[PDB]
Amino acid sequence: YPVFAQQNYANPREANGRIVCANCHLAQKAVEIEVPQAVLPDTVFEAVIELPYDKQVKQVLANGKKGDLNVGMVLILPEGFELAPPDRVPAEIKEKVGNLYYQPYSPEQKNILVVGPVPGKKYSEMVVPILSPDPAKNKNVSYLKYPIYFGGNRGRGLVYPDGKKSNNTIYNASAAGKIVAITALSEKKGGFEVSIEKANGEVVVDKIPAGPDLIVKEGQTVQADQPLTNNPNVGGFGQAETEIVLQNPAR
Ligand code: HEC
């Protein structure tokens, strides 16, 4: 979630240009962003974002069932740029944005907007209203060509802030040995327990939560770190760049 990024990285964009969502949403899926090639000072323009994905395909939910995906993003604008205030946003534009509540990454970083989690069904495409700055007032911005960084995500991440995996990833054998048994868990608890008899006869038991499907069976021998399930993840993260020129009016 965008809040996980806000709570674990002062700056969402790393030196090499990679966005921190990429530290937990490990699969890549293309995204697109579009802004006008140029804008006048203190003006309201729009950024249009695409977070494409097949909506017929469902993901593994936290509870282990299948279901809809949620989207979120981070928009890194130049110093000085900021979310357009409600009163400066055209009604036609207001309707386009919908019931979305963009927010600064931090109170001190008003040029970094985030949003989500929100339903992917209705927000596969998002419109963000930005207020261009004015160098004639702000010493920190000039009439240049500025870069714009974007990061969009679809689906539940594979790793939590504490470092543990979610149920939306590949599970591997904790040891090498023969699979002596595969017990399904409850009916409400879901998942399976895969008992592996090691060379020394000791039997370890790998717990696999509901979500991913098994690709092994009783009698099969596996190596340590060998995948026991498929890769359930159907979401993805993506980054895109663009740029905008901050025009200099001339009277
Ligand atoms: C690792 C510490 C993470 C960071 C950094 C970010 N996300 Fe994340 N995200 C993470 C997990 C483990 C999950 C699943 C949580 C759960 O309880 O199931 C998520 C989930 C989201 C979602 C929800 C999608 C859904 O289908 O429900 C969204 C839209 C999302 N994350 C977006 C997102 C963005 C844009 C981030 C960067 C700004 C980002 N996440 C970072 C783990 C982590």
* 73 Cβ inside 6 Å of ligand 1: yes
Which residues make Cβ contacts (< 8 Å) with residue 96, sequence separation at least 6? 46, 127
Location of structure tokens 């092994």: 216
Cα 151 to ligand 1 centre (Å):
12
- What CATH number does the domain containing 206 carry? 2.40.50.100
Q: Which of 162, 160, 166 is nearest to 208 (CA)?
A: 166
Preceding amide of 117 cis, omega within 30? yes
* 20 Cβ inside 6 Å of ligand 1: yes
User: Within this chain, do residues 131 and 221 fall inside the same structural domain, yes or no?
Assistant: no
Judged by DSSP in three states, 221 sits in strand
* 3 Cβ inside 6 Å of ligand 1: no
Nearest CA to ligand 1 atom 42: 157
Compute the Cα dihedral for 165, 120, 88, 133 and give only its sign. Answer: positive
Nearest CA to ligand 1 atom 35: 73
Judged by DSSP in three states, 165 sits in strand
Q: To test ligand 1's pocket by mutation, which of 61, 68, 153 has the most ligand atoms within 8 angstroms of CB?
A: 153
CA distance 111 to 114: 10
Cα 57 to ligand 1 centre (Å):
19
**How many independent structural domains does the chain possess?**
2
User: Within this chain, do residues 19 and 47 fall inside the same structural domain, yes or no?
Assistant: yes
Which residues make Cβ contacts (< 8 Å) with residue 67, sequence separation at least 6? 58, 59, 61
What experimental approach yielded this model? X-ray
* 159 Cβ inside 6 Å of ligand 1: yes
- What CATH number does the domain containing 41 carry? 2.60.40.830
User: Within this chain, do residues 58 and 154 fall inside the same structural domain, yes or no?
Assistant: yes
Strands of 32-34's sheet in order across: 32-34, 44-50, 125-131, 82-83
User: Within this chain, do residues 160 and 201 fall inside the same structural domain, yes or no?
Assistant: no
**DSSP codes joined into one string, 185-211:** PTTTT--EEEEEE-TTS-EEEEEE-SS
Token pair for 14: 């790393």
User: Within this chain, do residues 164 and 176 fall inside the same structural domain, yes or no?
Assistant: no
* 112 Cβ inside 6 Å of ligand 1: no
User: Within this chain, do residues 13 and 40 fall inside the same structural domain, yes or no?
Assistant: yes
Binding-site sequence positions for heme: 1, 21, 24-25
Instruction: Give the angle subtended at the CA of 108 by the CAs of 105 and 110, to the nearest 5°.
Output: 55
Location of structure tokens 């962003």: 33
* 21 Cβ inside 6 Å of ligand 1: yes
CA distance 102 to 69: 19
Which residues make Cβ contacts (< 8 Å) with residue 64, sequence separation at least 6? 167, 190, 191, 209, 210, 211
Half-sphere exposure of 12 (CA within 13 A, CB side): 29
Partners of 177 in the beta sheet? Answer: 222
Nearest CA to ligand 1 atom 38: 2
| Phi, psi angle pair for 149, to nearest 5° | -105, 135
Determine contact, residues 232/214, Cβ cutoff 8 Å: no
Cα 6 to ligand 1 centre (Å):
11
User: Within this chain, do residues 118 and 98 fall inside the same structural domain, yes or no?
Assistant: yes
Q: Which of 199, 197, 198, 206 is nearest to 227 (CA)?
A: 206
CA distance 137 to 98: 31
Nearest atom of ligand 1 to the alpha carbon of 12:
38
CA distance 73 to 113: 8
Instruction: Give the angle subtended at the CA of 220 by the CAs of 216 and 222, to the nearest 5°.
Output: 80
Determine contact, residues 218/179, Cβ cutoff 8 Å: yes
* 116 Cβ inside 6 Å of ligand 1: yes
> Which CB contacts under 8 angstroms, 24+ apart, belong to 2-5?
2/72, 2/73, 2/74, 2/114, 2/115, 2/116, 2/117, 4/157, 4/160, 4/161, 5/74, 5/105, 5/114
Q: Which domain range does residue 182 map to?
A: 171-230
Judged by DSSP in three states, 156 sits in coil
